[PDB]
Short mmCIF file of C-alpha atoms and ligand atoms in Angstrom, two decimals:
data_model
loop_
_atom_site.label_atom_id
_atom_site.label_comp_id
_atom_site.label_asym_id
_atom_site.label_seq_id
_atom_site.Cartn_x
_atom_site.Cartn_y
_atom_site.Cartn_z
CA UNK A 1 19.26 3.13 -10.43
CA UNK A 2 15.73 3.04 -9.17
CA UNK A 3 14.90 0.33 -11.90
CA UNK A 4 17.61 -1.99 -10.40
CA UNK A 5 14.73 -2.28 -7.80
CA UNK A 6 11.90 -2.81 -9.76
CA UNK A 7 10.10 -6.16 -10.85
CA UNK A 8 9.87 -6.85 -13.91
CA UNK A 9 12.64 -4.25 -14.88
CA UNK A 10 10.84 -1.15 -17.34
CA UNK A 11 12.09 -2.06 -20.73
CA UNK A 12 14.12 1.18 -22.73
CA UNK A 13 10.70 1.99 -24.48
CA UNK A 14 8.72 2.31 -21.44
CA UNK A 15 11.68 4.73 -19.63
CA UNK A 16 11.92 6.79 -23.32
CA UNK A 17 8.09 7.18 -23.09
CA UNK A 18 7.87 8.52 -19.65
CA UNK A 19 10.54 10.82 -20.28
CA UNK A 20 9.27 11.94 -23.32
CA UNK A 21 5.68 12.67 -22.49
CA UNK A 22 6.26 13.03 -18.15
CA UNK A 23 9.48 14.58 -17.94
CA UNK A 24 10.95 11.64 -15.18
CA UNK A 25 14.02 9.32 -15.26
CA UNK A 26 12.27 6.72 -12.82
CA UNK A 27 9.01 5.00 -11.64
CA UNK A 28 8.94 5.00 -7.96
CA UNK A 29 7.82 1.05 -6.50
CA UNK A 30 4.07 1.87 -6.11
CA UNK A 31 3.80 4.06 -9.11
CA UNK A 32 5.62 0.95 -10.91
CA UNK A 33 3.25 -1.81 -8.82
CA UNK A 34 0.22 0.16 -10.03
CA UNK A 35 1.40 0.46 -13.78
CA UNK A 36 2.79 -3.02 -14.48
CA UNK A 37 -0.28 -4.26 -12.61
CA UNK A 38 -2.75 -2.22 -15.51
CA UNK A 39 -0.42 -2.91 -18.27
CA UNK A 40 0.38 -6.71 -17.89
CA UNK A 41 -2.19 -8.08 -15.59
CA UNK A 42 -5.33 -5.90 -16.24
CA UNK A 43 -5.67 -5.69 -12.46
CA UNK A 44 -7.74 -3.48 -10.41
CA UNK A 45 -6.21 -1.28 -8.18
CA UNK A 46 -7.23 0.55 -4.63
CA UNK A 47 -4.26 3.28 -4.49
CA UNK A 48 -4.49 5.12 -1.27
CA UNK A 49 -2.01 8.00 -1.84
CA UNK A 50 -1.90 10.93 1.36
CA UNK A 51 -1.74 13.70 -1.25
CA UNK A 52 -1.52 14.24 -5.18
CA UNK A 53 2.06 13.96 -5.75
CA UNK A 54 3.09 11.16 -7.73
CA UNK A 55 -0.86 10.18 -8.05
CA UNK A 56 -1.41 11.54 -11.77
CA UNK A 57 1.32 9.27 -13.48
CA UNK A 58 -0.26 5.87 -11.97
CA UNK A 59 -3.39 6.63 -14.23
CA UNK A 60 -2.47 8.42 -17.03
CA UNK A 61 1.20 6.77 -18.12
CA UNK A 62 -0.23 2.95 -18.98
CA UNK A 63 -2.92 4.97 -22.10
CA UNK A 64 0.03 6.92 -23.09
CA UNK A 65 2.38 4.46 -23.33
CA UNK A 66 0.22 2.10 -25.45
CA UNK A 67 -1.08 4.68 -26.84
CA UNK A 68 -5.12 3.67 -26.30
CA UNK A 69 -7.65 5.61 -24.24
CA UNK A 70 -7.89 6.01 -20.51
CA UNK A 71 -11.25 7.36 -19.13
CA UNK A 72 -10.47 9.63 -15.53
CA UNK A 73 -13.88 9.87 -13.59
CA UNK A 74 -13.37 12.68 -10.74
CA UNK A 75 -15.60 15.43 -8.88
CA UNK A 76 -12.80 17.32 -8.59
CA UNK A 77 -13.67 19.62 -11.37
CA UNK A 78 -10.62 22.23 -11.47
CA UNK A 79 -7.90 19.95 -10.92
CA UNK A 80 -9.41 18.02 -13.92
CA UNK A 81 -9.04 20.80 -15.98
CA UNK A 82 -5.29 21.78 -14.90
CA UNK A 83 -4.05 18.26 -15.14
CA UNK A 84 -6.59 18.19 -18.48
CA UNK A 85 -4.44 21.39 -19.81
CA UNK A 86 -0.79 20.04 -18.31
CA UNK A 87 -1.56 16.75 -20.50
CA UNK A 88 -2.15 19.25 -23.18
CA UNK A 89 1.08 21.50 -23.01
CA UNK A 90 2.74 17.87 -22.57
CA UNK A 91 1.58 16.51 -26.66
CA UNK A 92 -0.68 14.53 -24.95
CA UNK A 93 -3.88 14.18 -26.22
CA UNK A 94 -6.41 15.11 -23.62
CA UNK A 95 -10.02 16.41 -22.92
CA UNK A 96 -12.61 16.96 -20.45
CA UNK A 97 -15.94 15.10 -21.76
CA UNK A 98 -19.53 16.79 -20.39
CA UNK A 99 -22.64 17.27 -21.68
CA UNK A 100 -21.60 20.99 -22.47
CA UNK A 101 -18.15 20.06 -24.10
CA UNK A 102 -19.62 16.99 -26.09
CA UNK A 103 -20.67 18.75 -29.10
CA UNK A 104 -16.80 19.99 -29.42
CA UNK A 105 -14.92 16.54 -28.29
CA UNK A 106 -17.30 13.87 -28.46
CA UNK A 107 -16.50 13.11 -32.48
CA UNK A 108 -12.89 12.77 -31.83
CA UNK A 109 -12.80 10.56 -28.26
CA UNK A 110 -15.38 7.99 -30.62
CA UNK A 111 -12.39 8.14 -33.39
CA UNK A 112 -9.80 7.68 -30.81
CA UNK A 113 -7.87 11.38 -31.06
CA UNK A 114 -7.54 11.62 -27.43
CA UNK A 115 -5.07 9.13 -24.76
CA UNK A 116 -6.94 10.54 -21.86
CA UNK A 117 -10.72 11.48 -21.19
CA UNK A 118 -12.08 13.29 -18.23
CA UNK A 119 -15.94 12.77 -16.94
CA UNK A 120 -17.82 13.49 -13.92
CA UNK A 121 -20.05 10.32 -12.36
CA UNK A 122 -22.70 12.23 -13.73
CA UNK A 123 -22.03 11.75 -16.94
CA UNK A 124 -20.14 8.06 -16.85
CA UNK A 125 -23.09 6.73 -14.86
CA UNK A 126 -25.05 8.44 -18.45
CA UNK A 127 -23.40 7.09 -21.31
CA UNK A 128 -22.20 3.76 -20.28
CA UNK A 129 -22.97 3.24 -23.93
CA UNK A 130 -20.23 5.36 -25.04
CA UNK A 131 -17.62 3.68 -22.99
CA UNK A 132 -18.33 0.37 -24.49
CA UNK A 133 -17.86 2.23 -28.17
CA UNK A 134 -14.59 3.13 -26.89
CA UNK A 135 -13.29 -0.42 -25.32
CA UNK A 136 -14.83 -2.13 -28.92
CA UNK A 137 -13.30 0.64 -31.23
CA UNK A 138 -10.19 1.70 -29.50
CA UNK A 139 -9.57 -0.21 -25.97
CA UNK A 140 -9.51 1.32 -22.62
CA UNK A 141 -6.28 0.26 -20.58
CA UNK A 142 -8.06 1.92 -17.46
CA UNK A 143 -10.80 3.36 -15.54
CA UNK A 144 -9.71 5.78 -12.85
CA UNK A 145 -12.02 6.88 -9.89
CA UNK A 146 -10.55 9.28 -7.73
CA UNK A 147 -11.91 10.82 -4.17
CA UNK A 148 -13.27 6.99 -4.38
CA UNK A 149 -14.08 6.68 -0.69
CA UNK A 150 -17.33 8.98 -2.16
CA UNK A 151 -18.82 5.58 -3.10
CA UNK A 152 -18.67 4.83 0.67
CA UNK A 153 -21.97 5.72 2.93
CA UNK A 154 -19.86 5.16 5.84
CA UNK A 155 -16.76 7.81 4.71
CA UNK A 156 -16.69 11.74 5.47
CA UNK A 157 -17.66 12.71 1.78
CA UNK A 158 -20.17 10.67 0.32
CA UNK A 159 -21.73 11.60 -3.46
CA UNK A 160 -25.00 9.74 -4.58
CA UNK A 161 -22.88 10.36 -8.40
CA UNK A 162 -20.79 7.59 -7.69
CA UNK A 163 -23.56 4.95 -6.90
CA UNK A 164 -23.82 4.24 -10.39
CA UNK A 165 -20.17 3.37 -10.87
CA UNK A 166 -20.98 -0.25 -9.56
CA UNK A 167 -22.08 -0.39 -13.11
CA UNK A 168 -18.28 -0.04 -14.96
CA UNK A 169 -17.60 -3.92 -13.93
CA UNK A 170 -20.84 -5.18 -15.13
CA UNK A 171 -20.25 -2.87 -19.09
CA UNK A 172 -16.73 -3.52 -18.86
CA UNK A 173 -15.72 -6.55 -17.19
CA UNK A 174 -11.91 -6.86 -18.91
CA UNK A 175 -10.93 -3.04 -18.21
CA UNK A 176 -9.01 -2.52 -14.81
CA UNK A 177 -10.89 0.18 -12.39
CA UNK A 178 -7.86 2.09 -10.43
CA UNK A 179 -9.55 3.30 -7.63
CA UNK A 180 -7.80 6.44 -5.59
CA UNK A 181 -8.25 7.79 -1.81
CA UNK A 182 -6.46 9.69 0.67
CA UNK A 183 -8.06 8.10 3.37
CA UNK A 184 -6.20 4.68 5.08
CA UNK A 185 -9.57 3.34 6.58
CA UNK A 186 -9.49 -0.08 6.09
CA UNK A 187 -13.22 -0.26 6.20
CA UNK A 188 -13.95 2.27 3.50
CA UNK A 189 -10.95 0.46 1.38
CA UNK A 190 -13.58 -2.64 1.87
CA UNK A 191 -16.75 -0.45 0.63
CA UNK A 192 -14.63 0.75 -2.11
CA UNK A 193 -13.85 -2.56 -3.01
CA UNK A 194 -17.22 -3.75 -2.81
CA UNK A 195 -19.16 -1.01 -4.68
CA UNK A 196 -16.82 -0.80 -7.71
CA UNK A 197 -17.20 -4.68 -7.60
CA UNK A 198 -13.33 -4.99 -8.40
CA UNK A 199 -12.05 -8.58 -8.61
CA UNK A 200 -8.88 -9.41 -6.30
CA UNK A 201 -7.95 -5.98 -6.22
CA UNK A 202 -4.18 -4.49 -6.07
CA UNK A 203 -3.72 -2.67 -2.47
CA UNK A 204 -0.85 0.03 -2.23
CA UNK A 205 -1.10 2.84 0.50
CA UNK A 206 1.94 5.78 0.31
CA UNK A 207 1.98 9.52 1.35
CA UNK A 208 2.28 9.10 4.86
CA UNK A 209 5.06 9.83 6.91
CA UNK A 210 3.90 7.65 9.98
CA UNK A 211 5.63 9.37 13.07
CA UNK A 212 4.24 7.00 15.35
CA UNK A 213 6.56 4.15 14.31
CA UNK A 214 9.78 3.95 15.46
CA UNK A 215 12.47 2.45 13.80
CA UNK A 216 15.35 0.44 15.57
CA UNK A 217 18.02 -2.61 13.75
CA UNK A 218 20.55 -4.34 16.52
CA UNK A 219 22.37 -7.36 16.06
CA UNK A 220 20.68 -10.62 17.47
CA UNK A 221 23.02 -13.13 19.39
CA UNK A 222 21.14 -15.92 18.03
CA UNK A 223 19.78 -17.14 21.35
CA UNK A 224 16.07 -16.14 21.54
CA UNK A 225 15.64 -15.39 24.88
CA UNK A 226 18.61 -13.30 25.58
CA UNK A 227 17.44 -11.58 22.29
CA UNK A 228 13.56 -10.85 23.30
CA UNK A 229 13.93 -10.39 27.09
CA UNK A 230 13.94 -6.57 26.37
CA UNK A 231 10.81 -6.57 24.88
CA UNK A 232 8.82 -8.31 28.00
CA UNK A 233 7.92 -6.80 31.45
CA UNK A 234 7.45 -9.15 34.30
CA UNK A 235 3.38 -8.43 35.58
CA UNK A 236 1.14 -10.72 37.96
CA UNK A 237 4.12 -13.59 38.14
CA UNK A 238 3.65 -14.08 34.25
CA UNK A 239 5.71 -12.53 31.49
CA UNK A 240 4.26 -10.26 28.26
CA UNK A 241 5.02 -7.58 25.69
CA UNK A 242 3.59 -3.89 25.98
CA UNK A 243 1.10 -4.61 24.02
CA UNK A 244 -0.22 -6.46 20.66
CA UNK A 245 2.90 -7.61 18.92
CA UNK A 246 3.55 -9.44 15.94
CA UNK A 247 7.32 -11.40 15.30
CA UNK A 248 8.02 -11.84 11.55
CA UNK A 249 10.28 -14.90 11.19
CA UNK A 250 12.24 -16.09 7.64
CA UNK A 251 11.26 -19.88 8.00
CA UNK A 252 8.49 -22.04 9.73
CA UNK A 253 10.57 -24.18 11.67
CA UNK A 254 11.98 -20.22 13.59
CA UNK A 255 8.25 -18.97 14.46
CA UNK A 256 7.80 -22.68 16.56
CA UNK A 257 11.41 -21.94 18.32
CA UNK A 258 10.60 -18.38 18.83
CA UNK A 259 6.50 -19.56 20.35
CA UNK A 260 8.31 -22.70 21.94
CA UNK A 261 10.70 -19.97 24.26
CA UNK A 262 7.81 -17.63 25.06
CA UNK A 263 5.58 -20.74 26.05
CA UNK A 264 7.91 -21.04 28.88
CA UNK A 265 7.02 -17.78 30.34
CA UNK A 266 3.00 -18.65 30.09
CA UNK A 267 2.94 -15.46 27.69
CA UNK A 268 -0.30 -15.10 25.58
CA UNK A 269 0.81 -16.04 21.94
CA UNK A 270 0.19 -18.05 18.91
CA UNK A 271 1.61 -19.14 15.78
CA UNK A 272 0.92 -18.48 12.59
CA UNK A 273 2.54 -20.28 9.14
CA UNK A 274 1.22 -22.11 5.78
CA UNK A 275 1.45 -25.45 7.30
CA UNK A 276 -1.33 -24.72 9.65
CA UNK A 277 -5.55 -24.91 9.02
CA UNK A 278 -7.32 -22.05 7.87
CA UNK A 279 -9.79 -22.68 10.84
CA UNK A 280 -7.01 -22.64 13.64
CA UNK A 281 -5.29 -19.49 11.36
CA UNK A 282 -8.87 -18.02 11.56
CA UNK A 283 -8.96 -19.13 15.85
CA UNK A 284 -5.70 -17.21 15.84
CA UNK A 285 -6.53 -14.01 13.93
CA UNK A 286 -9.87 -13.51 15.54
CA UNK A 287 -8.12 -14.01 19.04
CA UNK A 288 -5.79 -10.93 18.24
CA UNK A 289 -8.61 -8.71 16.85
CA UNK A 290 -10.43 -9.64 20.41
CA UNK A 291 -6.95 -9.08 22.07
CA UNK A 292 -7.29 -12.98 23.66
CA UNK A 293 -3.65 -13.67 22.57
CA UNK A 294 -1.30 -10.42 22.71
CA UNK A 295 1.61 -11.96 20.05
CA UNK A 296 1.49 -13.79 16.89
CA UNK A 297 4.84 -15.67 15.97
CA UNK A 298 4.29 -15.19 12.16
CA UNK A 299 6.05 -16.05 8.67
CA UNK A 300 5.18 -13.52 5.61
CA UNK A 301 1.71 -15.47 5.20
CA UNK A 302 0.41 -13.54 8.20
CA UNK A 303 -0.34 -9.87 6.94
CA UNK A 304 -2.42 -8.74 4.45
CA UNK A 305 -6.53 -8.17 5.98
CA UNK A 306 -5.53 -8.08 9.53
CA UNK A 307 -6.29 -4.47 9.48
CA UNK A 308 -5.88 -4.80 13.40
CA UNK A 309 -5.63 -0.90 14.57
CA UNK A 310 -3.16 -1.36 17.51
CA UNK A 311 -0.36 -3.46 16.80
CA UNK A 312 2.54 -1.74 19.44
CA UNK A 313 5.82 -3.69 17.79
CA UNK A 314 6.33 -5.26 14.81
CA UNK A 315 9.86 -7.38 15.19
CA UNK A 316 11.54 -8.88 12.57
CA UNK A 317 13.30 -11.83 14.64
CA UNK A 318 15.73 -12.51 11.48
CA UNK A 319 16.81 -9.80 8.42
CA UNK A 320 13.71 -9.70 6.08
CA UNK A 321 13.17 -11.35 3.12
CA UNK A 322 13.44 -7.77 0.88
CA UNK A 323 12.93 -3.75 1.44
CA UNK A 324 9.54 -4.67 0.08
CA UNK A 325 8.61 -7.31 2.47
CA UNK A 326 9.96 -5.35 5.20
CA UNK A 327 7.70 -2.37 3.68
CA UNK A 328 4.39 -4.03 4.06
CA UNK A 329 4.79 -5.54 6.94
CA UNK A 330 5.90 -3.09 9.59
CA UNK A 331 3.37 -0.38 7.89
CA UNK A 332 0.72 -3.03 9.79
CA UNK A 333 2.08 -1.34 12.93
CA UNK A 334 0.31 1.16 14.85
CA UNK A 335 -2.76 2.16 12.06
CA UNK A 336 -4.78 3.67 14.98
CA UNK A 337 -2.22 6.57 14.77
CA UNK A 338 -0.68 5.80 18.32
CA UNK A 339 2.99 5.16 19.20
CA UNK A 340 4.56 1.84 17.93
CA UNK A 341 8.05 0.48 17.68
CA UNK A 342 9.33 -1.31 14.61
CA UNK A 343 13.00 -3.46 15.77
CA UNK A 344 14.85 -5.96 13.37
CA UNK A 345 16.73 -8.67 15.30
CA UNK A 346 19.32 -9.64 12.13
CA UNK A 347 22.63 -10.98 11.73
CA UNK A 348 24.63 -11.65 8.62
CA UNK A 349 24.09 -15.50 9.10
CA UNK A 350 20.05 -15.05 7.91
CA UNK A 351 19.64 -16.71 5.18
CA UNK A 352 17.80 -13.65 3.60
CA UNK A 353 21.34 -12.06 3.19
CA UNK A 354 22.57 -15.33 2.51
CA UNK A 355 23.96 -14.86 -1.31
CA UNK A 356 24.99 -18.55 -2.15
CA UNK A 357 20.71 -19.12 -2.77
CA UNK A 358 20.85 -16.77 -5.66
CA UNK A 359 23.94 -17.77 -7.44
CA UNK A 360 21.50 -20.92 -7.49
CA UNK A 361 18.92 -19.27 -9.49
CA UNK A 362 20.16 -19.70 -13.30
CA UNK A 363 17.53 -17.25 -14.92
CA UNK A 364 20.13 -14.13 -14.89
CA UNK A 365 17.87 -10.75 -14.84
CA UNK A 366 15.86 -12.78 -11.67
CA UNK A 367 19.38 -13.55 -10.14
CA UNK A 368 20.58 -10.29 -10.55
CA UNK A 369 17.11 -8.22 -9.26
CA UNK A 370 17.17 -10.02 -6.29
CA UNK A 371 20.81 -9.76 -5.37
CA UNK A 372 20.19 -6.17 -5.92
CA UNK A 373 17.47 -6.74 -2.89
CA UNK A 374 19.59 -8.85 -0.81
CA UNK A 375 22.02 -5.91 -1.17
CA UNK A 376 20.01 -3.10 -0.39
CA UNK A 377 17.93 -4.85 2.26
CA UNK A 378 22.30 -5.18 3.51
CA UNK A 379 22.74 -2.21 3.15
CA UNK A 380 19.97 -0.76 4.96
CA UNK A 381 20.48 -3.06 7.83
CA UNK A 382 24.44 -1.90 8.06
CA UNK A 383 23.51 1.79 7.98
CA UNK A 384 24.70 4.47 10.66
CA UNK A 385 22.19 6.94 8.52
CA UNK A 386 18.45 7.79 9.33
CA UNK A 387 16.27 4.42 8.78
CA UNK A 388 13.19 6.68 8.14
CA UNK A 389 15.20 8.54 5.20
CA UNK A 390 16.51 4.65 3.97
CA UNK A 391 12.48 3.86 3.87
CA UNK A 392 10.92 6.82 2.37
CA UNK A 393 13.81 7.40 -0.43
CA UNK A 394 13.11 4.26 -1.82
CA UNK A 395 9.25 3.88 -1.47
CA UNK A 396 7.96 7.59 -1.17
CA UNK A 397 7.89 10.17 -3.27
CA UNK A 398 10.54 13.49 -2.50
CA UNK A 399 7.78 15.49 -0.86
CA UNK A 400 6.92 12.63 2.04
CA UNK A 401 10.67 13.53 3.25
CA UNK A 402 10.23 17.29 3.41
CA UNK A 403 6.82 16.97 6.07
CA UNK A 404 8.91 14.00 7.51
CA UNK A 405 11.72 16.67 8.13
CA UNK A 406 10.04 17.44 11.94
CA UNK A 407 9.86 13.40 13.33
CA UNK A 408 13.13 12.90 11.68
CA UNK A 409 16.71 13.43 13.60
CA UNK A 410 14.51 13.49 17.05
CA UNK A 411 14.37 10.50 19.53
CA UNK A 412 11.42 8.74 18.23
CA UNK A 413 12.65 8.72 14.64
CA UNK A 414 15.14 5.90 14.46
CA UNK A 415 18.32 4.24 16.58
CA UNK A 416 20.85 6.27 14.39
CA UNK A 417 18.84 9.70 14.86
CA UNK A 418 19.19 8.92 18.72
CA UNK A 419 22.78 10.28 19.03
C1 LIG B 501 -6.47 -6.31 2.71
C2 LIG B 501 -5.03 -6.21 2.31
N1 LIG B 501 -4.66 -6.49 1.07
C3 LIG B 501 -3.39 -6.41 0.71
N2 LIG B 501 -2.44 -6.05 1.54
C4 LIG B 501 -2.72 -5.74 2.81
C5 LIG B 501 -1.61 -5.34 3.70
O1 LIG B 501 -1.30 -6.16 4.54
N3 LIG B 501 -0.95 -4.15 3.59
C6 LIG B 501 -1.28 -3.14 2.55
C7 LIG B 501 -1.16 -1.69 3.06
C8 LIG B 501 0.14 -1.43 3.82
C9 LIG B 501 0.24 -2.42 4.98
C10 LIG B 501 0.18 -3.87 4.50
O2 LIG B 501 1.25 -1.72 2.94
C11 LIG B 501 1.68 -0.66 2.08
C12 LIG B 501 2.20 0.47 2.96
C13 LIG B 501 3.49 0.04 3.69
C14 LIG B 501 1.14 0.88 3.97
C15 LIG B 501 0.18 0.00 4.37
C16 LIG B 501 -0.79 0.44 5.33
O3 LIG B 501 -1.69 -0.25 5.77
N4 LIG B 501 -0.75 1.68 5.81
N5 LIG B 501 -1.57 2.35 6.73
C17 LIG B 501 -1.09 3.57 6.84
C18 LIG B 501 -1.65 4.63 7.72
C19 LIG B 501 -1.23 5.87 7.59
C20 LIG B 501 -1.74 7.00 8.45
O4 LIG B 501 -2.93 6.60 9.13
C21 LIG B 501 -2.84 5.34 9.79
C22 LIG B 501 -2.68 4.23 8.74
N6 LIG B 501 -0.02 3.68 6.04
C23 LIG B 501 0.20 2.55 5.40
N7 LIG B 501 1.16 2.16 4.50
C24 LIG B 501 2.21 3.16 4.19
C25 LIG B 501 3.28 3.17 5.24
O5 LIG B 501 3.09 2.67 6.34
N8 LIG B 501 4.44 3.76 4.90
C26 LIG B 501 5.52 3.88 5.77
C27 LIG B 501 5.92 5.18 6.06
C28 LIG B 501 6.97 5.41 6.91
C29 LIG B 501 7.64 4.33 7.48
C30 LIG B 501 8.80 4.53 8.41
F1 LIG B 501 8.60 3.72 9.54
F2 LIG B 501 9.96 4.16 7.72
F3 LIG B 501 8.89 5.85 8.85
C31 LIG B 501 7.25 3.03 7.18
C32 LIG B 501 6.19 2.79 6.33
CL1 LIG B 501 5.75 1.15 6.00
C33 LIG B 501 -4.05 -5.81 3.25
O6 LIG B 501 -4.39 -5.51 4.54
CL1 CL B 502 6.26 15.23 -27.16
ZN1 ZN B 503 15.89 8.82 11.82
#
């Protein structure tokens, strides 16, 4: 099941629902991440998605499903009114709100006849007033803003409608804002963030099929030299990697063996754990943005706002700690577009496939998820099958793997497509 892979596991109600009213057995990860995140945690979202497939549900399943309101702000007029009339042919509640339709809808939004309400900025950025009616009298369980990167001067596509959106935070301060893009830009993911003044803001980014990254899992002998050697050239009398490089490890004490090694060939690196400062952690982040060090020996607390364009390999010296894990981390790898590699280093000895740590755990659903994990993040690893395929069946929606199609069962796809 897709559900033995979720966290926390959808409870019967919330699977009958989305059959019921979406017509779908499963949430994908992200669409799940997104949803819990609104339903439980009342979190704001940035949810970069490539295309529209899979993009609807992440907005307009949480009102549905506690059966509230959800408010849809989007200049994308037409495709408002399709998804508007699919909600409709669905026996879900829905309408678009304008200054033309108000006279007709307006009545029965304020008396709470209606899960899902669409509005320009236009009119949002007009009746903030309304909205607040609507979060006293009924409760909104989101705000979504699509084509967000609008708010953004610095984008492709800016609208001075979306200006006044700044505003929803400040009206409603305890309703989630899911904000939605097709653009990557890490940048314009920061104006976003800024402009819709969300607080500690959810990140997810699916859609793409990322040819440039390469996909690769050997055996490692243990010995870290022997294990590494293929990924240096020997240049100047000094040793180095292609180019910027970052080496996941599963512990602390693995990314100081790992530096400690390639220290002995004078190769420019640094390393990168919780134990450290924040200053020296800051030294060595701003040293690879400036490409002064070309590695970072990391743990999992190196990652998230890097949003360094050229990182060449990602390798995971060790079997990740999950699929998930493994997800974020080696999508940091070549975000300029430009060829990267992506090679695990694992054996079955890593303590991330080490099962005796979860028949610790006593709390049985927690156990049993991550087990579940453990064996998929196994089973991945022991594959002969396409490691692309592995990746985007579990993360991406169905249509990723038909535009994926071309890169996959070529040479730059994966070790197993190399035959
Ligand atoms: C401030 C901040 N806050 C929180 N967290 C982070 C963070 O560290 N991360 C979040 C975002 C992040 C990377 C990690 O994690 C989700 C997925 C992962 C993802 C990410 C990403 O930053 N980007 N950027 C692209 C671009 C696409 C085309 O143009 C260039 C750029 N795509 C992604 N993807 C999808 C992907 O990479 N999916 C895939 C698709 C195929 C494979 C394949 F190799 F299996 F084929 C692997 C992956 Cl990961 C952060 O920085
Ligand atoms: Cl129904
Ligand atoms: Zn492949």
């Amino acid at each position: 099941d897709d559900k033995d892979f979720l966290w926390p596991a959808p409870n019967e109600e919330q699977v009958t629902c989305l059959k019921m009213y979406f017509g779908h057995s499963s949430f994908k990860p992200v669409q799940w991440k997104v949803i819990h995140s609104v339903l439980e945690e009342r979190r704001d979202n940035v949810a970069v998605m490539a295309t529209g497939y899979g993009k609807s549900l992440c907005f307009q399943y949480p009102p549905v499903y506690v059966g509230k309101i959800g408010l849809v702000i989007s200049p994308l007029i037409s495709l408002m009114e399709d998804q508007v009339l699919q909600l409709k042919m669905s026996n879900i509640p829905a309408c678009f709100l304008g200054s033309a339709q108000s006279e007709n809808v307006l009545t029965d939004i304020k008396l709470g006849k209606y899960r899902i309400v669409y509005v320009t900025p236009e009119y949002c950025s007009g009746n903030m007033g309304l909205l607040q009616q609507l979060e006293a009298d009924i409760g909104i369980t989101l705000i979504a803003v699509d084509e967000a990167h609008c708010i953004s001067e610095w984008g492709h596509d800016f609208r001075d409608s979306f200006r006044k959106l700044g505003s929803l935070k400040t009206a409603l301060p305890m309703v989630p804002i899911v904000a939605l893009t097709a653009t990557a830009s890490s940048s314009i993911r920061e104006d976003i963030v800024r402009c819709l003044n969300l607080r500690n803001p959810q990140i997810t980014c699916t859609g793409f099929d990322r040819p440039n990254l390469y996909l690769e899992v050997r055996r490692k002998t243990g010995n870290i030299l022997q294990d590494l050697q293929p990924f240096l050239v020997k240049t100047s009398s000094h040793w180095e990697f292609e180019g910027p490089t970052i080496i996941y490890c599963p512990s602390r004490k693995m990314t100081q063996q790992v530096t400690g090694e390639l220290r002995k060939l004078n190769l420019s690196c640094g390393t990168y754990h919780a134990g450290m400062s924040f200053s020296t952690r800051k030294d060595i982040h701003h040293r690879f943005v400036r490409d002064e060090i070309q590695c970072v020996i990391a743990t999992i607390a190196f990652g998230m706002g890097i949003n360094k364009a050229d990182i060449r390999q990602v390798i995971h010296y060790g079997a990740p700690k999950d699929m998930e894990s493994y997800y974020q981390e080696i999508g940091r790898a070549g975000r300029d577009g430009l060829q990267s590699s992506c090679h695990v280093l694992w054996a079955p000895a890593d303590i991330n496939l080490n099962r005796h740590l979860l028949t610790e755990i006593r709390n049985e659903k927690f156990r049993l998820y991550k087990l579940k994990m453990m064996a998929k993040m196994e089973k991945y690893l022991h594959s002969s099958r396409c490691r692309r395929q592995i990746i985007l069946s579990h993360f991406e929606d169905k249509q990723v793997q038909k535009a994926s199609l071309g890169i996959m069962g070529t040479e730059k796809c994966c070790d197993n497509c190399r035959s």
